[PDB]
C-alpha cells in the first residue's frame, strides 16, 4: 500500500498566524491651571 499524503486535523497547525498580538496602556494624569489666582483678602496696600 501507499497513502500518498495525509495530515492531522484540527489544532495548533491551523493557529500559526494568530498570536494574538498585544497593546499599550497610559495614565491617567492631569494638571490644573493656576494662572488666574490672587489672594482674596488684601489690606497691606492701604499703607498708601
Amino acid at each position: 500500500p501507499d497513502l500518498k499524503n495525509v495530515k492531522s486535523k484540527i489544532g495548533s497547525t491551523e493557529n500559526l498566524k494568530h498570536q494574538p498580538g498585544g497593546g499599550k496602556v497610559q495614565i491617567i494624569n492631569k494638571k490644573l491651571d493656576l494662572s488666574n489666582v490672587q489672594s482674596k483678602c488684601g489690606s497691606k496696600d492701604n499703607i498708601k
Binding site: 500500500p1 497513502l3 495525509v6 495530515k7 492531522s8 486535523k9 484540527i10 489544532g11 495548533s12
Partner: protein, 112 residues
Amino acid sequence: SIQFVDWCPTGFKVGINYQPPTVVPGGDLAKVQRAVCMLSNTTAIAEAWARLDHKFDLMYAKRAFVHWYVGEGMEEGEFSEAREDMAALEKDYEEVGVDSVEGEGEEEGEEY
C-alpha cells in the same frame, strides 16, 4: 511526574454526589462509605490504536477476509477511505502530544 500535556493550563473537572456505590446480589465489591469514577483523555491510547491499525494493515496487505465485505455492497476503496482516517488521527494524536513546539531544527550551548 504523572505527566500532563505540557501545554495544559487546566485539566481537571469535579463532580460530587451523596449516594454511595450500591451492592448487587451476586456482586463482587465491598460495601463502602465513598467512591470515585475517573474518565481520562490522554495521548497514550493512540499507540494502542497503532497496534489495531497495524493489525488492519497486516491482513489488508494479504486481502485477508476482504471478500466477506465487498459482497455486502461496500468497496475496497471503502476500507482505504476508513484507513486514511486512522492515519489523520494517529498524526493528530502526535500533534496534541507536542510540547507546544512549532520549530524546525535544534540548538546547542557551550560544553567541553
